[PDB]
Enzyme design. Structure first.
Site, PDB file in Angstrom:
ATOM      1  N   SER A 151       0.821  -1.204   0.000  1.00 56.83           N
ATOM      2  CA  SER A 151       0.000   0.000   0.000  1.00 56.83           C
ATOM      3  C   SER A 151       0.858   1.259   0.000  1.00 56.83           C
ATOM      4  CB  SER A 151      -0.934  -0.002   1.211  1.00 56.83           C
ATOM      5  OG  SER A 151      -0.207   0.144   2.418  1.00 56.83           O
ATOM      6  N   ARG A 166       8.433   6.271  -3.147  1.00 56.42           N
ATOM      7  CA  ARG A 166       8.643   7.098  -1.970  1.00 56.42           C
ATOM      8  C   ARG A 166       7.728   6.591  -0.869  1.00 56.42           C
ATOM      9  NH1 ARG A 166       8.781  11.337  -4.153  1.00 56.42           N
ATOM     10  NH2 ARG A 166       6.583  11.549  -4.752  1.00 56.42           N
ATOM     11  N   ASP A 205      -3.235  -1.662  -2.541  1.00 52.67           N
ATOM     12  CA  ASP A 205      -4.436  -2.047  -1.808  1.00 52.67           C
ATOM     13  C   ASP A 205      -5.696  -1.470  -2.440  1.00 52.67           C
ATOM     14  OD1 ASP A 205      -3.210   0.335  -1.063  1.00 52.67           O
ATOM     15  OD2 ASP A 205      -4.179   0.396   0.903  1.00 52.67           O
TER      16      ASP A 205
HETATM   17  O1  LIG Z   1      -3.155   2.871   2.339  1.00 49.82           O
HETATM   18  C1  LIG Z   1      -3.842   3.844   1.558  1.00 49.82           C
HETATM   19  C2  LIG Z   1      -2.921   4.555   0.593  1.00 49.82           C
HETATM   20  O2  LIG Z   1      -1.936   5.249   1.380  1.00 49.82           O
HETATM   21  C3  LIG Z   1      -1.051   6.056   0.602  1.00 49.82           C
HETATM   22  O3  LIG Z   1      -0.107   6.674   1.419  1.00 49.82           O
HETATM   23  C4  LIG Z   1      -0.300   5.225  -0.418  1.00 49.82           C
HETATM   24  O4  LIG Z   1       0.498   6.097  -1.215  1.00 49.82           O
HETATM   25  C5  LIG Z   1      -1.247   4.389  -1.261  1.00 49.82           C
HETATM   26  O5  LIG Z   1      -0.514   3.467  -2.071  1.00 49.82           O
HETATM   27  C6  LIG Z   1      -2.217   3.618  -0.379  1.00 49.82           C
HETATM   28  O6  LIG Z   1      -3.192   2.969  -1.187  1.00 49.82           O
END
Ligand SMILES: OC[C@H]1O[C@@H](O)[C@H](O)[C@@H](O)[C@@H]1O
Ligand SMILES: OC[C@H]1O[C@@H](O)[C@H](O)[C@@H](O)[C@@H]1O
Lengths: 480, 474
Positions: A151, A166, A205
């Site tokens: 995620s 990042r 996710d």
């Molecule tokens: O977890 C929820 C979201 O958080 C964000 O900080 C991330 O960049 C995403 O990839 C993720 O889906």
């Protein structure tokens, strides 16, 4: 009791309002950012001004009749790490065994030097623990296929490959940036004997959440209700959607033609909308948002939309409002522990305040504040704390609707056949468990350019255990 | 292709429209009718006190109860074990009501009906509880989906049959005793019918049990309603407003900690005088000629699934009478109700990309009616007009109840849950979608619709009756 304070809070609440004009503006601006982000850009354009719009290399939506043997899934969220075994039984049914574990605090402290081996070695050890507990007989025997839900922004280059772009959401581990997280995970899996566990798919996710809905949505539901978005409202926020291969110009012009000839029409796009409008050209902003972004956040200047919406940051917004009110000699913080403890107030604390009632003298609000930061409060003080909490959440839920409305507009998902509805898959502690959050998102959607008639055709449906099930569906597809 | 016909359909479709102004009119009138019906009449809606005062919690647990549900089309018997934690186990057998009971050609009596029900009860026990059929002291809740002059939780006399049922010697008879007698006369005297409920009442109680405790927090189930063979709904009413209830019984209930009692509005009777209800030439024909209870259940006759298909059949005959629509060798003529709502459901969402083949097959299967593509195109316009009117009228009673009880403005973020059961609301394409459209047009507005959640209760009737059995004593 204190009129100057009671009027100071009313003034701070008005700073959180999101008007229909703001919703419409941000919706249209979001689409402009979607279109900028769908074009190729340099490795580092000082001002790309377009969303990430990451191709996830997912082109096929599940049907619900998929069938296979038990797959594995590993989901690294913002707060927990999950491992589970999913058996897809077809006919929109599945079996799941899962174990959830918090990410130890050791990994978010810069006081100690943390590395990528520490992290993935921990994840691999949990993977082993899960298999020892749920598949003790065939842990080292089977050739497990695993889908990996990561995620975090990944420069996805294939279904099974991609480098971390990042970190976000309190994670700070330098040696991971630019590294293929599938290999990093696979490396530590081999080093503990689980080399027979192959990480065959990497997904966000958001993507996994969408795939889960396409499978579980009953054939009767898929008939009229087609799932169009998988999004998250938990520790962070983000969402995905399906984009015509033609419009994904940042995708190799050759690969597009190759996919198109194979019968594919769209590819899932990870908008990474927590970064939406990082230049704050239009996003509602208060002095407390700047402080959180610049001083207390681990990624200053990034994820600014997220820092106003997701559950990792809302409780911290209250803490800065209270300290500012104490700085002005308006609110007595007593022997509380708010001072010099960023994020000590969690969104889980606000959820007990959101719907607390005055018929019980807001006793939950009292207990929640004492449990979270040893802060005593009078009734008039809790009444005002509740006004602030309800204003902070309403803004988040209203901003939460903009990216969804924008996507539905761009893809013309609502201009379908008679009686046709669209389904938005949502996962995360906020949308799942924050009182009235979904109710306020819909209020914003009705205010958005799609109007109340559009809101009615949109169904915000919860997909618990979404992340993992979707990753399993990708594992079933790919080969060992 | 027939141009004159294409304009006849557009004109018939416009006759089914329900405007926002009309919805508002009917909502306010419905509330007026609720308040009239809550007064004594010594002779307004029925507004029947069901003598149910306690909403289940979801943590109730007890021994396996029995339930018997006599609908408009089927009769169900089942055994329900309440396991608490909003969960339960159920074994049920469902059987069609034999056509013998809908034929006036034969002399039918109440013994015929309850003798049949008792035998089904016996078969069920012989099939699922053969070891403890004559041993246990079963408690049974009885769901009787017809208007009953309810006098207690376990007593009440039939007021009038509805939905094709006609059995004269049942009117004025306590249906619980009738049922209990035929249970005794086959040895099942150890089965005590300890509770009588409407299928609306049971639907509400079922949802209150199954609605997760997390849901009960902000989402309170406030209505149990039906949109199936017939239509009806219930709600909780302040004991003070139930003036037709004995002023003494009111006082005792209040002292016992009770605040409300469930009311069976019988909203299928809403505006039987046609003072405001939309009416077409076909509605009168159905009510006067084809209906078993002419002058009654007129709201129902425009909404429920027993009548919607029949509305199309009369539209088609009228178009054939006018020498506009070729009925081929069909059997629609002189066969009332041959077109079912189940036939219309295959037409509602059929697409032209398949030459509307579902409509073709559905029409051939139901009445051997062949159709051209252009003919099916127009038949689809009629079906969609009949259903939209039904779903729009279906929203009025719900809006009216929510307004009268001011259920939506009760706390910050407050949502309400409406429990719905019945083949129409459950399975008719887009019916719930159009109901919500109407609610948004009703006086509660889009802001109100969003706070209302139409949730389906598949096996509500029986579970709710079981919950009443658990309360009452053997
Ligand atoms: O977890 C929820 C979201 O958080 C964000 O900080 C991330 O960049 C995403 O990839 C993720 O889906
Ligand atoms: O089945 C739905 C409804 O149908 C009506 O005809 C009956 O009078 C009601 O008692 C019943 O609840």
């Amino acid at each position: 009791s204190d009129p100057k304070l009671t009027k100071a809070v009313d003034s701070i609440c008005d700073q959180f309002i999101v008007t229909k004009s703001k919703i419409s503006q941000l919706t249209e601006y979001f689409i402009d950012c979607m279109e900028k982000g769908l074009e190729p850009c340099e490795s580092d354009i000082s001002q790309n001004k377009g969303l990430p719009m990451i191709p996830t290399f997912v082109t096929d939506k599940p049907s619900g009749q998929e069938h296979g043997v038990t797959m594995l899934a590993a989901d690294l969220g913002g707060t927990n790490f999950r491992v589970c075994s999913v058996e897809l039984l077809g006919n929109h049914e599945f079996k799941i065994e899962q174990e959830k574990s918090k990410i130890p605090t050791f990994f978010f402290q810069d006081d100690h030097h943390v590395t990528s081996k520490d992290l993935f070695q921990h994840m691999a050890l949990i993977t082993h623990q899960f298999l020892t507990k749920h598949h003790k007989d065939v842990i080292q025997d089977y050739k497990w296929k695993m889908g990996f839900t990561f995620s975090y922004p990944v420069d996805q280059t294939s279904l099974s490959s991609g480098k971390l772009i990042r970190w976000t959401k309190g994670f700070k581990i330098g040696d991971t940036v630019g590294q293929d997280v599938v290999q990093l995970f696979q490396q530590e899996l081999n080093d503990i004997g689980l080399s027979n566990v192959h990480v065959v798919a990497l997904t966000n996710d958001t993507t996994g959440t969408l795939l889960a809905r396409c499978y579980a949505s009953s054939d009767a539901a898929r008939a009229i209700n087609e799932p169009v978005i998988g999004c998250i409202f938990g520790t962070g926020t983000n969402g995905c959607y399906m984009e015509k291969l033609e419009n994904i110009h940042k995708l190799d012009p050759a690969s597009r033609e190759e996919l198109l000839s194979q019968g594919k029409t769209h590819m899932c796009i990870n908008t990474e909308w927590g970064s939406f409008d990082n230049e704050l050209n239009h996003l509602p902003t208060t002095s407390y948002d700047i402080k959180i972004d610049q001083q207390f956040s681990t990624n200053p200047g990034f994820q600014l939309f997220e820092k106003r919406v997701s559950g990792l940051y809302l409780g911290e917004i209250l803490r800065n409002i209270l300290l500012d009110l104490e700085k002005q000699e308006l609110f007595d913080l007593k022997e509380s522990v708010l001072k010099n403890n960023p994020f000590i107030l969690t969104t889980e604390t606000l959820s007990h305040i959101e719907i607390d009632t005055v018929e019980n003298d807001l006793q939950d609000t009292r207990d929640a504040l004492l449990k979270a930061a040893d802060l005593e409060t009078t009734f008039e003080e809790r009444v005002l704390i509740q006004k602030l909490v309800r204003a902070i959440s309403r803004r988040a839920a209203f901003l939460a609707a903009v990216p969804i409305a924008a996507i539905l507009i761009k893809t013309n998902a609502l201009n379908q056949s008679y009686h046709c509805q669209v389904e938005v898959g949502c996962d995360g502690s906020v949308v799942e468990h924050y009182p009235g959050f979904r109710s306020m998102m819909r209020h914003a959607l009705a205010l958005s350019p799609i109007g109340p008639e559009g809101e009615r055709d949109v169904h915000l449906r919860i997909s618990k255990d979404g992340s993992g099930v979707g990753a399993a569906l990708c594992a079933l597809h790919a080969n060992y």
